Every structure is written in C-alpha cells, then in structure tokens.
Design a protein around this ligand. Structure first.
Ligand SMILES: CCCCCCCC/C=C/CCCCCCCC(=O)OC[C@H](O)CO
Ligand SMILES: CCCCCCCC/C=C/CCCCCCCC(=O)OC[C@H](O)CO
Ligand SMILES: CCCCCCCC/C=C/CCCCCCCC(=O)OC[C@H](O)CO
Ligand SMILES: CCCCCCCC/C=C/CCCCCCCC(=O)OC[C@H](O)CO
Ligand SMILES: CCCCCCCCCCCCCCC
Ligand SMILES: CCCCCCCCCCCCCCC
Ligand SMILES: CCCCCCCCCCCCCCC
Lengths: 82, 81
C-alpha cells in the first residue's frame, strides 16, 4: 500500500507534464510558462533522483527519471524564442 | 548528505512554482498553462504527501505541503480564466 501510493503519485506528477508538452507544440506558445520555474524544477528532479538512489526509494527514482525527460522537452521549447 | 540533498531538491522543485505564481498574476495571462497538468499534479503532491508520511520521509513531507499551496494558487487562476 506504501508502494501503491508511491507509484500512483509518481505516475500522477510525471505524466502531468504530458498535457503540458502537448499544449506547447500544438499551440506553439510558451509565453505564459515561467523559464525560472522549469529551470529550478530541472535541477530539483536531478537532486531528487540522487536522493532516491541514496534512499533506495524506487517510486521517486522512477518518477524523477521520466519527469526529467518531460521537463527537458518543455524547458527546451521555452528556451527557444518563447 | 542524504538530508542535505533531500532539502535542497525539495527547495528547488517547491520554490519553483513561485516564479510561476508571480508570472501569472503580474501578466494576468494563463492561456499557455495546462489545466490538466496542474489538476493532475495537484492529486499527485497529495498522494506524495501520504507516501511521505508512510515513509517517515521528512523532506518529501515538507516539500509536498508547500507545493500544494503554490499549485493551488496557479490552479485557481487557471480555473478562473
Ligand atoms: C520592475 C521593472 C523591471 C526591474 C528589472 C529587475 C527585475 C525585476 C523583476 C522583473 C522580472 C525579472 C525576472 C526575475 C523575477 C522572476 C519572475 C519572472 O516572472 O521571471 C520571468 C522569467 O523570464 C520566466 O519566464
Ligand atoms: C494531437 C492532436 C490532434 C487531434 C486533436 C484532437 C484531440 C485533442 C483535443 C483537444 C484538447 C482536449 C483535451 C484533451 C487533451 C489533453 C491535453 C490538452 O492539452 O488539453 C488541454 C486542456 O484543456 C488544458 O490543459
Ligand atoms: C499548512 C497546510 C498547507 C496545505 C495547503 C492546502 C492546499 C489546499 C488549498 C490551498 C490553499 C491555497 C491558498 C492560496 C491563497 C491565495 C489564493 C489566490 O490565489 O488568490 C487569488 C485572488 O483571489 C485573485 O483575485
Ligand atoms: C490545510 C487546510 C487549509 C484549508 C484552507 C484552504 C483554502 C483553500 C481555498 C480554496 C478553495 C476554492 C478554490 C476553488 C478554485 C476556483 C473554483 C472556481 O472559481 O470555479 C471556476 C470555474 O471552474 C470557472 O470555469
Ligand atoms: C543530470 C546530471 C545529474 C546526474 C548525476 C547523477 C549520477 C549518479 C549519482 C547519484 C548518486 C550520487
Ligand atoms: C535556502 C533554504 C532552503 C535550502 C537550505 C537547506 C538547509 C537544510 C540542510 C540542513 C539539514 C540538516
Ligand atoms: C486532500 C488531503 C486529504 C487528507 C489526506 C490525509 C492523509 C493522511 C496521511 C496518513 C495516511
């Protein structure tokens, strides 16, 4: 049950960026998105990923590796003339 | 060091929403922000909060209670456009 809530919470925050990734490319707008947010966020999951390794905490390990991918795509789009 | 990394990682992702909160209210624009994202993200941090309790994992407990506040503000603004 500990594990169930971890992987569902992990799924939730991770796949939450997908509607955001989609919105960016379909609407071609990043204007309202904060650069400072995703930048600050990008370093966080990296430190979260390391924390999870040192913690042997898998739901946060899995969550942060996939979230990094999602966040890097939104970050990329925002960084290029947005 | 685990804890050092726990609380900085916590600070980074949590305090990351503040630049977004400010941007929202100062520009008065939320068009590009995804509602499905923040709705989905909101349920997540709550579920992370319980997970953090069950883990006795303090940085993940603290991080998610503070983000919950931040995420609720961006969500309100997004919901009221
Ligand atoms: C006050 C007249 C300008 C004064 C000049 C000094 C800067 C003062 C703050 C303005 C934005 C500076 C950005 C740093 C503050 C973060 C809030 C933010 O929205 O940053 C936007 C960022 O580019 C995400 O896209
Ligand atoms: C790849 C697209 C080609 C075909 C398009 C037809 C189906 C798309 C439906 C429109 C959005 C409906 C919401 C469902 C999509 C979830 C992600 C999304 O961006 O929704 C925006 C939401 O209203 C704010 O967050
Ligand atoms: C210590 C426990 C913290 C846990 C967190 C509970 C999360 C559930 C709701 C969050 C309330 C957020 C309150 C935000 C207050 C400002 C809301 C705001 O955005 O006001 C906009 C204004 O009204 C536009 O006209
Ligand atoms: C820790 C416990 C502390 C408890 C204190 C927490 C206070 C948070 C209050 C906000 C709830 C109301 C927020 C509802 C968001 C806006 C809803 C609304 O305006 O609907 C817009 C509609 O969706 C347009 O289409
Ligand atoms: C993005 C760069 C950060 C990834 C570096 C982590 C390498 C493994 C170290 C984690 C445990 C210490
Ligand atoms: C800036 C405030 C947030 C990050 C500071 C981290 C300090 C906590 C590390 C000490 C834990 C024992
Ligand atoms: C919305 C939040 C509802 C309250 C959740 C409380 C969870 C208790 C944590 C221990 C399990």
């Amino acid at each position: 049950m500990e594990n169930l809530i971890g992987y569902v919470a992990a799924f939730l925050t991770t796949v939450s960026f997908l509607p955001q990734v989609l919105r960016v490319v379909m609407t071609k707008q990043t204007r309202d998105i904060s650069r400072n947010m995703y930048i600050m966020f990008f370093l966080g999951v990296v430190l979260w990923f390391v924390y999870g390794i040192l913690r042997s905490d898998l739901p946060i390990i899995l969550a942060n590796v996939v979230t990094l991918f999602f966040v890097t795509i939104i970050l990329y789009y925002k960084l290029t003339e947005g």
